[PDB]
């Protein structure tokens, strides 16, 4: 992966190639939109970093990603990738939210399609023919 | 939570799925108008009812959000487009009645055909063959009479289906709590809560007056000087101090004074400045010149094309059965891909064009930052504004010498210099006391200052006064003759042609006061100059 001229990111957070002697590592595999790509980073006050997946701003390994249009968007529609854009309460580091729950800001119940009812989740939206930052990116996170 | 979050909300799902929606229909929209086939208008029809329907339920769920309840600047200007009532506010069958009319008024205008008094065979609509006569023929009587004919077989036609529309316009504007349907037009350019620049609806008209007072000199100069051109070529058939008979305006309607060139050319035997014969000389394509003019975007600090751009578009006809319509437009997709439809062939014309519709994907660039409903122009007349600053600089000899087609070495006298701007006079000189006449008898009908008795008596002495045009056939109120022209006739506001050649020029010179030009105005580029770039840039990524 060090010697690769196939991924765009290469963000560790090059002596890391031989540092590598640690106990276990994880890795945080998802697909993101290409401007979101600022957002995956620690601290990012934003959509991504809030809602979807948010980073340690302490100790973090690598972040790595690269172009994937060719296979994670559709031409005529890839609308199964969603996104969390709505939730009350941002995320911590290494927190995961799956809820899809109808959206109330005002704290109340709520049920769909009445008064301030909305769906947490966007879908994507990526065809073959949209712009650069914003196509599929396969991240992965170390 | 407070009620600014939950119009923020409300746009969050909007301006994520009014993104696809329209990326959905303006998709189905491109690939009808590049590949022209029964299934593409189906679609077409099919995704742009479902992205109006999308929108008719978002606007009516903004309606339920009052726009005298949130402060913050965004969401208000948002949800103010939004709940604009519009044909909702009349009842339910009486507009749709009146959409009829415009269905039919639009029919049997398009349809709409004129007939020779001798050859009844041979018919003409507005294009070609009409306009052909209008623009090119060289005969009194038969442009007299051809002139005549487009104001009798579709005037007569619009004129009683054209008394219902101004009614329930009028009749839907002042539902919807304004003065008349001039009045919603003026309703456009309002701004309210934002200082210096606010704009009553009472502004446009004074503006609009207060400037062409600037304007009406170097008309009645071209005026004066227009005549005695063509007495020169018409003998004895204008008069030396009466004004411009309408049949010889080299238009149909009187807009554009640019097809007179032929008959008004002082010095007809001088060069006109022409560089398609080195465009062949280094076998140039479209390829070179779009990317040319990315060069030339590119000189002045811009950013470059995008991936999407060369990906998506389609700047060639396609040949065969995929058909496509060859009018230059660029075409704002949605989802950051940017492209556009055009006939592209090896000329200086669609050299100028290319930077022109290329120039409305730059201000489609600098908008991306904002969402989607702030995603368009802040007016009606800043995207053709913007789109003719580089028609205008990249149209300058000096750079035809900096790109090869014309030699470095090339003189430019001010003899064929005023003679191509003086063509350019008749074009942009032309059009404003025009533009300024229609709106105002426009404003003054919908208003009810004119009596249906006086319309046409009102329209034609105001072409006397304002435009300096007697009408040479006397027209009584069987005719609709504005409405033959097609912005009055099929619901359009014709004042931003005004305002943006007036925008256009107070940008080209706070450009050329940025390019540092030395020269005259008509001589200035904005090559290279990097402050052209950031003034040009800046005051484009405010959008709405």
């Known amino acids: 992966l060090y010697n690769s001229t196939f991924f765009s990111t290469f963000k560790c957070y090059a002596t890391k190639l031989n540092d590598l002697c640690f106990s276990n590592v994880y890795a945080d595999s998802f697909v993101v939109k290409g401007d979101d790509v600022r957002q995956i980073a620690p601290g990012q006050t934003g959509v991504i970093a809030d809602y979807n997946y948010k980073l340690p701003d302490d100790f973090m390994g690598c972040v790595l990603a690269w172009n994937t249009r060719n296979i994670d968007a559709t031409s005529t529609g890839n609308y199964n990738y969603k996104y969390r854009y709505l939730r009350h309460g941002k995320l911590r580091p290494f927190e995961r939210d799956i809820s899809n729950v109808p959206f109330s800001p005002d704290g109340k119940p709520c049920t769909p399609p009445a008064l301030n009812c909305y769906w947490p989740l966007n879908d994507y939206g990526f065809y073959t023919t949209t712009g650069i930052g914003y196509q599929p990116y396969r991240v992965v996170v170390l | 939570s407070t009620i600014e979050e939950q119009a923020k909300t409300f746009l969050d799902k909007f301006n994520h799925e009014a993104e696809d929606l329209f990326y959905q229909s303006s998709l189905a929209s491109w690939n009808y108008n590049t590949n022209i086939t029964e299934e593409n ?3 077409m029809n099919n995704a742009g009812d479902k992205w109006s329907a999308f929108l008719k339920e978002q606007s009516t769920l903004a309606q339920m959000y009052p726009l005298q309840e949130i402060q913050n ?13 519009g044909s909702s506010v009349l009842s339910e069958d009486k507009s749709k009645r009146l959409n009829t009319i415009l269905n039919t008024m639009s029919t049997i205008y398009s349809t709409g055909k004129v007939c020779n008094p001798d050859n009844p065979q041979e018919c003409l609509l507005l294009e070609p063959g009409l306009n052909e006569i209008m623009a090119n023929s060289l005969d009194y009587n038969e442009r007299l009479w051809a002139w005549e004919s487009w104001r009798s077989e579709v005037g007569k036609q619009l004129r009683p289906l054209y008394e219902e529309y101004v009614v329930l316009k009028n009749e839907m504007a002042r539902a919807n709590h304004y003065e008349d349907y001039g009045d919603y037009w003026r309703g456009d350019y309002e701004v309210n809560g934002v200082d210096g620049y606010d704009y009553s609806r009472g502004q446009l008209i004074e503006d609009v007056e207060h400037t062409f007072e600037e304007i009406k000199p170097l008309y009645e100069h071209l005026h004066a000087y227009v005549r005695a051109k063509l007495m020169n070529a018409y003998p004895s058939y ?6 411009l008979p309408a049949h010889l305006l080299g238009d149909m309607w009187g807009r554009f004074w ?11 035997q001088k060069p006109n400045i022409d560089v398609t014969d080195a465009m062949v000389d280094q076998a140039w394509d479209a390829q070179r010149i779009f990317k040319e003019a990315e060069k030339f975007f590119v000189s002045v600090g811009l950013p470059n094309m995008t991936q999407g751009f060369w990906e998506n578009s389609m700047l060639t006809d396609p040949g065969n059965v995929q058909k496509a319509v060859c009018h230059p437009t660029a075409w704002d997709l949605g989802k950051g891909d940017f492209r556009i439809l055009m006939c592209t062939k090896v000329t200086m014309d669609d050299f100028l064009t290319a930077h022109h519709e290329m120039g409305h994907i730059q201000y489609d660039m600098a908008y991306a930052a904002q969402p989607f409903l702030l995603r368009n122009g802040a007016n009606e007349g800043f995207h053709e504004a913007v789109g003719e600053i580089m028609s205008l600089s990249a149209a300058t000899p000096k750079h035809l010498k900096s790109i090869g087609l014309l030699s470095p070495d090339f003189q430019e006298d001010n003899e064929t210099e005023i003679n191509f701007l003086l063509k350019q006079a008749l074009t942009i000189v032309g059009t404003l006391p025009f533009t300024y006449m229609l709106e105002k008898w426009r404003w003054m009908v919908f208003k009810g200052e004119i009596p249906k008795d006086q319309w046409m008596k009102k329209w034609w002495e105001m072409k006397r006064e304002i435009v300096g045009v007697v009408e040479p056939v006397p027209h009584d109120e069987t ?3 504005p409405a033959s022209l097609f912005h009055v006739s099929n619901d359009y506001s014709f004042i931003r042609y005004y305002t943006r050649t007036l925008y256009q020029f107070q940008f080209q010179e706070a450009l050329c006061q940025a390019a540092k030009h030395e020269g005259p105005l008509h001589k200035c580029d904005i090559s290279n100059s990097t402050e052209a770039g950031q003034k040009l840039f800046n005051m484009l990524r405010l959008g709405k």
């Open chain 2, 41 to 43: 208008v189906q679609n």
């Open chain 2, 73 to 85: 600047l965004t969401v208000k200007l948002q949800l103010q487009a939004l709940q604009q009532n």
């Open chain 2, 238 to 243: 204008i008069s030396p101090i009466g004004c």
């Open chain 2, 258 to 268: 640019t097809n007179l060139y032929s008959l008004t050319v002082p010095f007809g």
């Open chain 2, 479 to 481: 005719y609709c003759d």
